[PDB]
C-alpha cells in the first residue's frame, strides 16, 4: 500500500532499469577510478567510471580471505539486488571478484551519506528529518514486504541522498553468506545496534527501528547521543535511551523518536504504526525542497 509508485518515481525507476539494461557483465578492466568516496569496516568505496557505457558508478571493495566456493555463493546471493527496485533503495549494477576483493558496483549518490552531510551541515533540521524518516520507513517496508529481509545496518552512513532529492538505503543484509563472512569481524567506535541484538536475543525489523531512532537523534543534535566500546554497548543495554533536547524540536518529533527508542522491541513501535504517526502525517503533507537544501548545504 505505502509502496505505491509515484509517476516521477516510476519514470526514474524505469529509466534506471533501461540504463542498467545495457551494461552487461562487469570486469575489473571496465572501470577507471575517479576518486575515493570513503571507507570503513573492511570496505572502501570509489567513485568509478564504467568505461563500456558512460555510467559513473560507486564501486565498493570488500577484502575477504574466504574459499572461492562461498565467494561465489556471495556473488550469487547478491544477484537478488537486481530485484530490489524502489525509489528508496540504492540501485545495483553488478558484483564480481578480483585480486582478493569482492566488488559491488552500485548507483552513485552524489550527495553521499547523511553521515557526511551531517559533518558539513552540523545538524539536520526537523522538517528535513521528516522526509528522511519517511524514506527509511518506506524502504524498510519494501525490503520486508517484497524481499522478506531486514536491513541490519541502519545508520547515517548507510542512508544515501542525491541532488535529485532522493533518500535511498544501502548496505543491507541481502546476502546471508556475506553477512556471516564479515559481520563478526569489525567493530566501530559508535554503535547503532538495538539492545536485543546486543543481548543476542531474537531480533526483527524492530531492531532497525531502534537504529533509525538513534540515527535521527544524532542527526538532529549533530552529535552521537550516547571510552571502551564495551561501556558504550553496556550503556545501550542497561541505561535509559537518548532523547532530543526539550525546547528545540516539536512534541510530535520527540514522541516519534521515543517510540523508536523503546528498549523492549515488543513495545517499540512497528512500521505500520510509524507510517500513521503524527510526525509522519505532518512531514508527508509538507512541501520541502530537499534537493535545494542538500545542494546549498553541501555545495552541489
Amino acid at each position: 500500500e505505502e509502496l505505491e509508485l509515484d509517476e516521477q518515481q516510476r519514470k526514474r525507476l524505469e529509466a534506471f532499469l533501461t540504463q542498467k539494461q545495457k551494461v552487461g557483465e562487469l570486469k575489473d578492466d571496465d572501470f577507471e577510478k575517479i576518486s575515493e568516496l570513503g571507507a570503513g569496516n573492511g570496505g572502501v568505496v570509489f567513485k568509478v567510471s564504467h568505461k563500456p557505457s558512460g555510467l559513473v558508478m560507486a564501486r565498493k571493495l570488500i577484502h575477504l580471505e574466504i574459499k572461492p566456493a562461498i565467494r561465489n555463493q556471495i556473488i550469487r546471493e547478491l544477484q537478488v539486488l537486481h530485484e530490489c527496485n524502489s525509489p528508496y533503495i540504492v540501485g545495483f549494477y553488478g558484483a564480481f571478484y578480483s585480486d582478493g576483493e569482492i566488488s559491488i558496483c552500485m548507483e552513485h549518490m552524489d550527495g553521499g551519506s547523511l553521515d557526511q552531510v551531517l559533518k558539513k551541515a552540523g545538524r539536520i533540521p526537523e522538517q528535513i528529518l521528516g522526509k528522511v524518516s519517511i524514506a527509511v520507513i518506506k524502504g524498510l517496508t519494501y525490503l520486508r514486504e517484497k524481499h522478506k529481509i531486514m536491513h541490519r545496518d541502519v545508520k547515517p552512513s548507510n542512508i544515501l541522498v542525491n541532488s535529485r532529492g532522493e533518500i535511498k538505503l544501502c548496505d543491507f543484509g541481502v546476502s546471508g553468506q556475506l553477512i556471516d563472512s564479515m559481520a563478526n569481524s569489525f567493530v566501530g567506535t559508535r554503535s547503532y545496534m538495538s539492545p536485543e541484538r546486543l543481548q543476542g536475543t531474537h531480533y526483527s525489523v524492530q531492531s532497525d527501528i531502534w537504529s533509525m531512532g538513534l540515527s535521527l537523534v544524532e542527526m538532529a543534535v549533530g552529535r552521537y547521543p550516547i571510552m571502551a566500546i564495551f561501556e558504550l554497548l553496556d550503556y545501550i543495554v542497561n541505561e535509559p535511551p537518548p532523547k532530543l533536547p526539550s525546547g528545540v524540536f516539536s512534541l510530535e518529533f520527540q514522541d516519534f523518536v521515543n517510540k523508536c527508542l523503546i528498549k523492549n522491541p515488543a513495545e517499540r513501535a512497528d512500521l505500520k504504526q510509524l507510517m500513521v504517526h503524527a510526525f509522519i502525517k505532518r512531514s508527508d503533507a509538507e512541501e520541502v525542497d530537499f534537493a535545494g537544501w542538500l545542494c546549498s548545504t553541501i555545495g552541489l
Partner: protein, 259 residues
C-alpha cells in the same frame, strides 16, 4: 654433518656437529628498539622450555624488519579440525585425556612464568593421541578507528579482555593472564563436548557485550545440557571473576575425577 671430535670414550667417539631438521618458521614484519629487547628476554626463556605437550621452541632469527620464529613442525591436525570432523569419535574418556594433555602443558608454561595469551583449539595439534600446544607468548609483540576480531578468537577471550577492547588501543595492553588462559581452556573444553563454538556467529559488537557482561556464557551453561560434572569444569574456567577461575594444577584434579 660431522665436526671436530670432543674427547674419546669407551663407546666410540663423540664429535661436534650440525643437524638439519624439518621445522616451522613464522615470519613477522616489524613496523621502538625496546620491542626487540623484550622479545629477546622471552625467546631465551622459551628456548629453555621442555615438555612433551609443548612445541619445541628452536629460536628466533631477528633480521630487521623481518622477524622469524622457529619451532618444530607439528605433524597431525589441529584440535579445531579434529573435533569438527564427523568421522572423529569422541567420548567422555577421549575428551578428558585430550584435556589433561593440554592442562599438563599449560600448567608447565605457567610454572615457567609463561602466559600463553592465545590458547585455542587451532594452536593445539593432535597426532594419533599425541597433544602439543603451539604459539605461546605471541601477543605481547609489537609489529605489523576499527577493531578486526574473528569469531573464533572472541569465543576464547575472557570478559576482562573484551571489556578493555576499543579501537585504537594496542593489543599488548589487553589484560592477558594465567586466569585468562584458563578461560580460553574453558572454551577448548566446550569444543571437546559440543564440537562447535559456544557463541552463535553474530555481530562482533553483540559478541563483545555478551562476553564482557558474562551473560553469554551463562546462557550457554544453561541452555546447553552436558554432564553435570562436565558443566562444573566449564563454569569454573569461565568464571566471570577471574580470581575464581582455578589454576591448571587444580584443573588436572577436577578433570581426573570425571565419570
Amino acid at each position: 654433518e660431522l665436526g671436530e671430535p670432543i674427547g674419546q670414550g669407551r663407546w666410540g667417539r663423540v664429535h661436534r656437529g650440525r643437524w638439519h631438521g624439518e621445522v616451522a618458521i613464522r615470519l613477522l614484519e616489524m613496523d621502538n628498539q625496546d620491542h626487540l629487547k623484550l622479545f629477546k628476554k622471552e625467546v631465551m626463556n622459551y628456548r629453555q622450555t621442555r615438555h612433551e605437550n609443548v612445541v619445541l621452541f628452536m629460536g628466533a632469527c631477528m633480521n630487521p624488519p623481518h622477524l622469524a620464529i622457529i619451532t618444530s613442525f607439528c605433524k597431525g591436525r589441529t584440535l579445531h579440525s579434529f573435533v569438527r570432523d564427523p568421522k572423529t569419535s569422541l567420548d567422555i574418556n577421549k575428551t578428558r585425556q585430550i584435556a589433561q594433555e593440554i592442562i599438563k602443558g599449560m600448567g608447565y608454561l605457567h610454572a615457567k612464568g609463561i602466559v600463553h595469551k592465545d590458547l585455542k583449539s587451532k594452536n593445539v595439534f593432535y597426532d594419533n593421541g599425541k597433544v602439543v600446544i603451539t604459539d605461546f607468548g605471541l601477543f605481547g609483540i609489537s609489529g605489523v578507528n576499527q577493531l578486526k576480531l574473528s569469531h573464533d578468537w572472541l569465543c576464547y577471550l575472557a570478559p576482562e579482555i573484551v571489556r578493555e577492547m576499543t579501537p585504537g588501543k594496542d593489543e599488548d595492553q589487553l589484560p592477558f593472564s594465567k586466569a585468562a588462559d584458563v578461560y580460553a581452556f574453558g572454551t577448548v573444553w566446550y569444543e571437546l563436548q559440543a564440537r562447535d563454538w559456544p557463541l552463535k556467529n553474530q555481530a562482533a559488537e553483540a559478541s563483545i557485550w555478551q562476553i564482557g557482561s558474562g551473560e553469554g556464557m551463562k546462557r550457554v551453561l544453561t541452555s546447553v545440557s552436558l554432564g553435570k560434572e562436565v558443566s562444573e569444569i566449564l563454569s569454573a574456567c569461565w568464571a566471570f571473576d577471574l580470581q575464581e577461575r582455578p589454576s591448571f594444577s587444580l584443573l588436572m584434579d577436577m578433570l581426573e575425577k570425571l565419570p
